[PDB]
Amino acid sequence: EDLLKNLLTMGVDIDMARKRQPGVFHRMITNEQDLKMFLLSKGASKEVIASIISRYPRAITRTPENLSKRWDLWRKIVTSDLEIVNILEASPESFFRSNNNLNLENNIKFLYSVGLTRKCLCRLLTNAPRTFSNSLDLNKQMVEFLQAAGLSLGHNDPADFVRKIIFKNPAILIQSTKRVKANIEFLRSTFNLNSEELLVLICGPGAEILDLSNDAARRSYANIKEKLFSLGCTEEEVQKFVLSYPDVIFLAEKKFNDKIDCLMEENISISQIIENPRVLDSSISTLKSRIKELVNAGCNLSTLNITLLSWSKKRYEAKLKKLS
DNA sequence: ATTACCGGGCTCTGCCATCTTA
DNA sequence: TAAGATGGCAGAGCCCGGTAAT
């Protein structure tokens, strides 16, 4: 009824909220006012609250008992209200897209029993909140699948493989198994990878690779192959390269290319680059910036030791002084 | 004194499709 | 019989510095 009037004064973007969830507005009763007070209660700015309601209107259909309970459960993981408020601003949907607090609490219990610690749970909640709106079964599925792969490979105790992979890759429990499986079969195929190496890779330097959408790695890698073949690198050199620094897969196609090009526009050979993969850690912006400083001081670059382009500001700025 | 090796920090959606639900 | 509740999906890097090595 007076719904819209409320929202409007709250700062809500109604037109957008209607597009997202028309249903919420065909509701006789809604608790948009209790919500405002609750979030105001817990530190939330007036503008955050508007923003949160504008992205997930169904949030206003929650009761103060319900909100206070779920909030309280989050506080079993995170230590401050501020932490929580920030997670909610970044990702409203994780807090509000379920009202099933028993599941949440069973979810938390389960995650503990899998041998995860609180520090790890706080890390999931912080960096992959959507985990805690996952159904218990869902988190079960993923965890079970990881154990059943910890075993399908050399690994002794999956109950520890699982912990490693999560510390490294918190967002894992909010990937589908369709996705994660496809990413393993991809690394396994693409690099004729034994059971153990593949294992190490996936817990370590290539952990995030499992988070890529369908065909994203196949496509990103394909492009790496093409871009490096075009410059006289053999397949082996390409593979040695990516395996030595798998995260280069995560880069979007054009960023990898743009990145290679700026480097070579300077007489930096492709040999220099692939033998020092980490120089690609830098943003193009940072590279370019440094490249200027260094061509300025009469550096060559074709003959320089370019590992410095990816050194911390501290160790880079220092070496630069000396070059004057 | 100076570089290499290598792993850690930080990482936190927003939309649609398909069920349940009451 | 129309909402809620759930699952799934496209999208995709940069910087730091402890410590071994020279």
UniProtKB/Swiss-Prot annotation:
Predominant place of localization: mitochondrion
GO cellular component: a single term: mitochondrion
Domain of life: Eukaryota
Keyword terms of this UniProt record: DNA-binding, Mitochondrion, Phosphoprotein, Repeat, Transcription, Transcription regulation, Transcription termination, Transit peptide
Organism: Homo sapiens (Human)
Record's subcellular location: Mitochondrion
Interaction with DNA: annotated span: 97-98, 175-179, 252-259, 283-286, 312-319
GO molecular function, one term: double-stranded DNA binding
Domain remarks in the Swiss-Prot or TrEMBL record: Contains nine structural repeats of about 35 residues, where each repeat contains three helices. The repeats form a left-handed superhelical assembly with a solenoid structure that wraps itself around DNA.
Family the entry assigns: Belongs to the mTERF family.
Protein name: Transcription termination factor 1, mitochondrial
Oligomer status and interactors: Monomer.
Residue(s) at site: Interaction with DNA: A90, R130, A171, A216, R278
Function description: Transcription termination factor. Binds to a 28 bp region within the tRNA(Leu(uur)) gene at a position immediately adjacent to and downstream of the 16S rRNA gene; this region comprises a tridecamer sequence critical for directing accurate termination. Binds DNA along the major grove and promotes DNA bending and partial unwinding. Promotes base flipping. Transcription termination activity appears to be polarized with highest specificity for transcripts initiated on the light strand.
Gene for this chain: MTERF1
UniProt PTM: Phosphoprotein with mostly four phosphate groups. While the DNA-binding activity is unaffected by the phosphorylation state, only the phosphorylated form of the protein is active for termination activity. Functioning seems to be regulated by phosphorylation.
Shown part of the complete sequence: 73 to 396 of 399
GO biological process, one term: termination of mitochondrial transcription
Effect of R278A: Reduces transcription termination
